[PDB]
Amino acid sequence: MSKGEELFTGVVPILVELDGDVNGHRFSVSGEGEGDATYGKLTLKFICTTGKLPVPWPTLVTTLVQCFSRYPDHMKQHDFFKSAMPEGYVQERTIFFKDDGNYKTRAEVKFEGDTLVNRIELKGIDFKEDGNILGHKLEYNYISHNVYITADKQKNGIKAHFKIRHNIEDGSVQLADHYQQNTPIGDGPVLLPDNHYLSTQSALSKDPNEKRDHMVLLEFVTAAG
């Protein structure tokens, strides 16, 4: 039966590495944590190793491992993410921040031995020097959002579309429109997602005992519709 279903049987260790440049501002993120696909649970802590992070943490959330998503039995046949393992998959995205700049990301997610690794490249351009993102106007929070997993037969993978609302201090809201492509790293078999989706629920926090610019992240993700 199933592809790499057995790999996410228990608690998996996660390693995250991001290298990005936004409007010329270089920076690097490293994160360690663990995931429990059984419960769609993820616990991570990210550290900005290049000093102080230039953008807002919240804006990195989506970029910073859907294979940890909990799939209810009746819909396991659409688990594209777990089926690409251990080989992995490449996840690409364009994230447009309404009336602002956008992010371009390239990532590869795969197992390095028993560690699930997310290696990522990020590039930010057209950011208004005095807007929400660059002029840190975003609140340190997150909205339980949904992701519209839509197959893309041709790329042998999938395509996804969704948007994210970021709460602006003023009580308003900054929009982030995601466009994501996903192609399998191996040449192997993968499951093709019927038009489904993911109910997600994040929770960012701080570690008082942490002197470095960082973000604590707790999150549950489940597949529905």
Whole-number Å distance between alpha carbons of 7 and 111:
9
Q: Read off the tokens for 114.
A: 């028993």
3-state helix, strand, coil in the chain (%, to 5): 10, 50, 40
CB 124 within 8 A of CB 55: yes
Amino acid at 158: I
Whole-number Å distance between alpha carbons of 198 and 19:
27
What kind and span of H or E run contains 81? helix 80-83
Q: Read off the tokens for 136.
A: 């840190």
Amino acid at 189: P
Data resolution in angstroms: 2.5
CB 223 within 8 A of CB 126: no
Whole-number Å distance between alpha carbons of 88 and 90:
7
Burial-class residue 68 by CB neighbours within 10 Å (0-12, 13-18, 19+): buried
CA distances in angstroms from 217 to 17, 57, 146, listed in the order given: 15, 10, 18
Q: Is 156 left (phi over 0), alpha (psi -120 to 50) or beta?
A: left
Rg (CA), the chain: 17
CATH class of 1-225: mainly beta
